Design a protein around this ligand. Structure first.
Ligand SMILES: CC(C)CCC[C@@H](C)[C@H]1CC[C@H]2[C@@H]3CC=C4C[C@@H](O)CC[C@]4(C)[C@H]3CC[C@]12C
Lengths: 307, 338, 230, 57, 232, 71, 67
């Protein structure tokens, strides 16, 4: 109801995408992963299936793990195609490719929470409950694949290509006014149930495994502690950075962090950078689980001699 | 004294070692050069029998050339069926250790071997649908090596205390006990008329016995290490043995000496089973370099290696119509080449 | 399915038979097989008299004893007066090799010849087994029994009749730990197997707990190679 | 006693020197005879096609 | 070895009755049992079957669904429970056994047989002979022509001959074709042609009186023929 | 392009003139934003957040849009 | 920054409008134009003098002034 020339609060928007162009480089880093997690991941698909006599419990978990990582590798040229450019095509294309990523993100993790509980039975309970892994290794693996389809129903259901200003489009999951305030609960509950339940169940079972192997005295416990200390400290390298930052913006969006534009643009620069730390998990997942042991080191070199 | 008797033996050994040279005017490769080569013989794995969970130690075809027993050391003795892969019987053994098996010429009995030197004889075509122990022929003190059947009442157990025996099955006793070997006998095989049978011991000696009287007729010492496998030519005039000196040596029975050695300078590994094919042209052999060679039996060259096993090859057998050649490996698979 | 009405019931039988093998291989691979070597006079018949739960079988007598939900199987290979080179490959794939050596055999001579003392004889028997080609990845439990007989023989009769260069004291604490370390230097293969020695008495009962403590190591070490860690 | 075993060896070799021997040439000729005269009926030498073979597939 | 059995009595129609076959004498669990009936004026008709370990169960047409069959492996019995029987189901009921592998002898041993009485695509086997009065000594040949070509693509002609002496339970004579059962004399020898068959007796004694059922086995329902009586 | 934050956080709510400013931008609370956000910019390069809940703010956005109809 | 002096306009419904951008009398260019993105993602410059093109942005305004 009056006249004034103060206009200097500086609460303007900020939308800078990153310098030293990230969207041109990320598709390169995804390309270097996809062709390398094709030859280095279907190789475990060979050596498990080329013999057909290896059918113990860690011979079929490594089958599905090198499968669910391979099906995770089926979406890498098409997911990289949108990171450079924005989303290219219709609804059904990312109704199913973001379904295909989400089924293999949980099966790519819950198997590391099932190899780990297998490698707790096969070391600590090597006398009494050793029956339990063999008798129901198929039924458990179906119960892990079936569980991942359950949590990947709330991505097929809610998702379609959404558009906005100042950002080339890419698809999200809800319809309405609470579509962020219900995404942030569609995010945090299964992206912890697919992280904090495996990170707890690994570190409660690889602990007891390392309790036993430090007590028992064979010739080569010096190397078995070097792998179980590495399986945790790689799974922690590949999903603790991506699920701390993805925790942090939920604290930013709700109340907890004070929001400036370069703070959030640091977060978006971080979350893109640590999603690269989530995809190199799919690169070296067969390297530490399969190709570290004397079986497939023998198993692959057996086939190159006969072929 | 002792040597003054033994000097007669060595001079008599110098007689029979002289008499064989008196007859070998020309050997087998000198007489069969004007023959054709048999050419390349490649064979394909027509079935595969994948039932056990241990090492296959022996097989024996039935004389109807279809059924097939095979005995593995997890305490199972499966009677297969080679045409369509069906397990006719799984016979649970009393002792888990089984070193051979044999099928009856009538087809009624199978006889497991044993490391506990009790040749137990099973009965198949029985009332009440079981497969039960007919008789257990205790009476050896070694282990047991290869126990072929003469007919349904006479079984010749080789053993591990240098005693090839000859049992009866209605009564449980022996009838003869062919002694004369020094090392323990490792494999035997009967002649097609079942009147003689060879036996290959563990001192590079193959002795030709007879079923009626019970004395050794001839002793062939040509090998260097122990004779690991033996088999007859299909007319009872020759037999080819297998040693751990990687050589298959084809002797005969009427000229008393060694006709040919079958060796190649690339193979070093032992032999575990020899079995002539029908007509006696393809001498097969199963080495333990995981292969399964196919030798020509009238010229010394090789033919198509039947490789395909992921461990040793521990028994062979050609069918009595000469169709297929089942090999039993040390991974649990039998592979019926053809 | 191009089969007759009888042949369709033939391959129902050949799968009912195939079930009762595959539901038996998962009953024989759970249990533990233990080869039991050693000389026939060397206290070999005493260790089988610690716990036993189970005449024609003159060759091999098994012993199906059990302890803490673990069926064991000792195969006493004593009746084989034959050549070891022919039948020892039946016993590859065994879980452990319970060797045995009478500890009082340092000064007792062999029966057939008044030379090659039974300690030096059992060492040559141990070395041929422990460096066999069918036994590389199979560890060796090693019992030393008659240590209720041993310690009174050393204070009244010297040890160095057996061993030419000892240069040590004569107590049971020092001297027996030389024999124990004399044996474990006989394997040319050192980390592919591990010798779990034990000074068992003839009168105690802890040795069956020890043989449980030593197969729970090799079952773990059979699982570390199977799970992929080792 | 031990000579009583070794005496059996010499009379056993008395049996061995009395077996008539064909020459090696004429014994291989019988072996060459049985081989080719039955070679036409051994299915490993002459391979048969999948019609008359009992192992078809 | 025996398969004694019990049940029956006299049931009112539309009702039910449990038929128990306590098979005592062998190892039960490898024997796929059958159930074959004989109406008091007619021949044999196949009724039921259960495979080894109760895996496979077939049935006839005329009792399809309303007859249930079951096995008891530990208690060593055999159960057929009929629901809402008609008047066309009064018969003697046999409890036969059969084991199926290469070179076996199916339908070998036949049970004692219980009565059961009431109150008021398939292959067909013809037997053109009927009631041939014979004398001991003559070589008599019994015909049985079929409808399908019984020879399969693997050499077998699945035609099991039989015999039933009057009053007593039947028994096998000739399994698949010109093979003899365990314990029949060498006088019964068959000869086949695929669609037309013949059972030949070389000499015959007085104990070979009765009827001679040819039964095919090519596909369920396995149909008997109306057998030919032999008399004097 | 990863997580669409809304284009505004705070809100200027001190009253001023609707004649004073040049352009207008309106975004509806669709699949990214929890409120409707209004970006208003002069030639002076400054832009402002805007809450439509404020009483005088329903008087500025129509008057300038009425002043849009003056040229 | 004056842009699309073209009168490429299209009379549509306000159920497909998601954002608008009004540009009034400016220093570069004395025109008056409005920019809108359609719900599939487009660029459309409009007519402030054609009435149902002039007034539809007010109905979309009152479609969003309610909250
Ligand atoms: C929409 C698309 C992406 C869904 C794809 C579902 C596929 C990839 C998932 C769902 C069920 C999963 C299967 C579950 C069970 C088995 C059987 C197991 O012995 C091998 C793995 C295997 C075969 C899994 C392979 C992957 C699997 C087939």
């Amino acid at each position: 109801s009056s006249t004034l020339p103060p206009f200097l609060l500086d609460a303007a928007p900020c939308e800078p995408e990153s310098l030293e162009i990230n969207k041109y480089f990320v598709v390169i880093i995804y390309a270097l992963v996809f062709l390398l997690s094709l030859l280095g991941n279907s190789l475990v698909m060979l050596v498990i299936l080329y013999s057909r006599v290896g059918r113990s419990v860690t011979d079929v978990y490594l089958l599905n793990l090198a499968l669910a990582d391979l099906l995770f590798a089926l979406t890498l040229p098409i997911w990289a195609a949108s990171k450079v450019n924005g989303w290219i095509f219709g609804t059904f294309l990312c109704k199913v490719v973001s379904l295909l990523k989400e089924v293999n993100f949980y099966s790519g993790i819950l198997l590391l929470a099932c190899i780990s509980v297998d490698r707790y039975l096969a070391i600590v309970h090597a006398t009494r409950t050793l029956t339990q892994k063999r008798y129901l290794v198929k039924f458990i693996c179906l119960s892990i694949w079936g569980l991942s389809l359950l949590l990947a129903l709330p991505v097929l259901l809610f998702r379609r290509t959404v558009y906005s200003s100042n950002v080339s489009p890419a698809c999200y999951e809800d319809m309405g006014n609470n579509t962020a305030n219900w995404r942030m609960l569609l995010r945090i509950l299964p992206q912890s149930f697919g992280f904090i339940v495996p990170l707890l169940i690994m570190l409660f079972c690889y602990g007891f495994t390392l309790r036993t192997l430090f007590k028992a005295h064979m010739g080569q416990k010096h190397r078995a502690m070097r792998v179980i200390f590495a399986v945790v400290l790689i799974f922690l390298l590949c999903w603790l950075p991506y699920n701390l930052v993805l925790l942090a913006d939920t604290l930013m969006r709700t109340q907890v962090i004070q929001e400036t534009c370069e703070r959030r643009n640091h977060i978006d620069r971080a979350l893109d950078a640590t999603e690269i730390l989530g995809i190199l998990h799919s690169c070296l997942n067969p390297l530490i689980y399969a190709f570290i042991g004397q079986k497939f080191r023998h198993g692959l070199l057996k086939i190159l001699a006969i072929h | 004294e002792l040597d003054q008797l033994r000097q007669e033996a060595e001079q008599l050994k110098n007689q029979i070692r002289d008499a064989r040279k008196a007859c070998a005017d020309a050997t087998l490769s000198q007489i069969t050069n004007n023959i054709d080569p048999v050419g390349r013989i490649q064979m394909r794995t027509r079935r595969t029998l994948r039932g056990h969970l241990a090492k296959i130690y022996a097989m024996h075809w039935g004389t109807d050339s279809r059924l097939l027993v095979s005995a593995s050391q997890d305490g199972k003795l499966i009677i297969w069926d080679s045409y369509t892969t069906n397990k006719v019987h799984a016979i649970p053994l009393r002792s888990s250790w089984v070193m051979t098996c044999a099928y009856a010429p009538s087809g009624n009995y199978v006889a497991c071997g044993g490391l506990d030197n009790i040749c137990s004889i099973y009965n198949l075509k029985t009332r009440e649908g079981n497969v039960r122990v007919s008789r257990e022929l205790a009476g050896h003190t070694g282990y047991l090596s290869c126990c072929r059947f003469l007919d349904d009442n006479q079984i010749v157990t080789s053993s591990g205390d240098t005693t090839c025996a000859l049992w009866d099955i209605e009564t449980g006793q022996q009838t003869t006990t062919f002694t004369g070997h020094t090392g323990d006998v490792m494999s035997l095989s009967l002649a097609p008329d079942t009147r003689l049978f060879v036996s290959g011991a563990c001192d590079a000696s193959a002795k030709l016995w007879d079923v009626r009287e019970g004395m050794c007729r001839q002793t062939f010492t040509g090998h260097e290490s122990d004779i690991n496998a033996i088999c007859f030519f299909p007319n009872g005039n020759a037999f080819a043995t297998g040693s751990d000196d990687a050589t298959c040596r084809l002797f005969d029975l009427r000229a008393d000496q060694e006709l040919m050695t079958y060796s190649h300078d690339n193979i070093i590994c032992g032999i575990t089973s020899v079995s002539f094919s029908k007509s006696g042209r393809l001498l097969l052999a199963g080495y333990d370099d995981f292969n399964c060679n196919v030798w020509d039996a009238l010229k010394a060259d090789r033919a198509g290696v039947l490789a395909g096993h992921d461990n040793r090859v521990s028994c062979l057998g050609v069918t009595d119509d000469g169709m297929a050649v089942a090999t039993g490996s040390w991974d649990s698979f039998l592979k019926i080449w053809n | 399915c191009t089969l007759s009405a009888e042949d369709k019931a033939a391959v129902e039988r050949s799968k009912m038979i195939d079930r009762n093998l595959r539901e038996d291989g998962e009953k024989a691979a759970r249990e533990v097989k233990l080869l039991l070597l050693g000389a026939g006079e060397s206290g070999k018949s005493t260790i089988v008299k610690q716990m036993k739960i189970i005449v024609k079988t003159t060759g091999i007598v098994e012993t199906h004893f059990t302890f803490k939900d673990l069926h064991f199987k000792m195969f006493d290979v004593g009746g084989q007066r034959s050549e070891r080179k022919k039948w020892i490959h039946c016993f590859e794939g065994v879980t452990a090799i319970i060797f045995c050596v009478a500890l009082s055999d340092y000064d007792l001579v062999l029966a057939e010849d008044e030379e090659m003392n039974r300690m030096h004889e059992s060492m040559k028997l141990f070395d041929s087994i422990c460096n066999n080609k069918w036994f590389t990845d199979t560890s060796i439990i090693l019992f030393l029994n008659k240590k209720d007989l041993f310690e009174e023989k050393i204070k009244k009769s010297p040890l160095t009749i057996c061993y030419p260069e000892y240069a040590g004291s004569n107590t049971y604490e020092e001297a027996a730990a030389y024999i124990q370390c004399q044996f474990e230097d006989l394997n040319k293969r050192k980390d592919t197997k591990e010798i779990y020695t034990h000074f068992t008495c003839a009168t105690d009962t802890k040795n069956v707990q020890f043989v449980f403590d030593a197969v729970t190591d090799v079952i773990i070490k059979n699982n570390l190679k199977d799970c992929g860690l080792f | 006693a031990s000579i009583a075993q070794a005496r059996k060896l010499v009379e056993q070799l008395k049996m061995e020197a009395n077996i008539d021997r064909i020459k090696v040439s004429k014994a291989a000729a019988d072996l060459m005879a049985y081989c080719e005269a039955h070679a036409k009926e051994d299915p490993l030498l002459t391979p048969v096609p999948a019609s008359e073979n009992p192992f078809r597939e | 070895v025996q398969l004694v059995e019990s049940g029956g009595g006299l049931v009112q129609p539309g009702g039910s009755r449990k038929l128990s076959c306590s098979a005592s004498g062998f190892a039960f669990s490898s024997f796929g049992m059958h159930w074959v009936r004989q109406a008091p004026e007619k021949g044999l008709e196949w009724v039921a079957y259960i495979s080894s370990g109760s895996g496979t169960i077939y049935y006839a047409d005329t009792v399809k669904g309303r007859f249930t069959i079951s096995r008891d492996d530990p208690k060593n019995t055999l159960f057929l429970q009929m629901t809402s029987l008609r008047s066309e189901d009064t018969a003697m009921y046999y409890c036969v056994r059969s084991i199926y592998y290469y070179g076996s002898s199916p339908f070998d041993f036949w049970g004692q047989g219980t009565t059961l009485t009431v109150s008021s695509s398939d292959i067909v086997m013809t037997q053109a002979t009927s009631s041939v009065p014979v004398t001991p000594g003559e070589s008599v040949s019994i015909s049985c022509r079929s409808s399908k070509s019984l020879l399969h693509s693997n050499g077998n002609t699945y035609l099991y001959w039989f015999l039933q002496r009057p009053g007593q339970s039947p028994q096998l004579l000739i399994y698949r074709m010109s093979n003899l059962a365990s314990g029949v004399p060498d006088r019964f020898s068959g000869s086949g042609s695929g669609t037309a068959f013949t059972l030949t007796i070389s000499r015959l004694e007085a104990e070979d009186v009765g009827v001679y059922y040819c039964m095919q086995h090519l596909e369920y329902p396995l149909t008997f023929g109306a057998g030919t009586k032999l008399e004097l | 392009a990863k997580e669409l934050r809304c284009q505004c956080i705070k809100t200027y709510s001190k009253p001023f003139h609707p004649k004073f400013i040049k352009e207008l931008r309106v975004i509806e609370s669709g699949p990214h934003c929890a409120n409707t956000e209004i970006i208003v910019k002069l030639s002076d390069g400054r832009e402002l957040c805007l809450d439509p809940k404020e009483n005088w703010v329903q008087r500025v956005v129509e008057k300038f849009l009425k002043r849009a109809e003056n040229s």
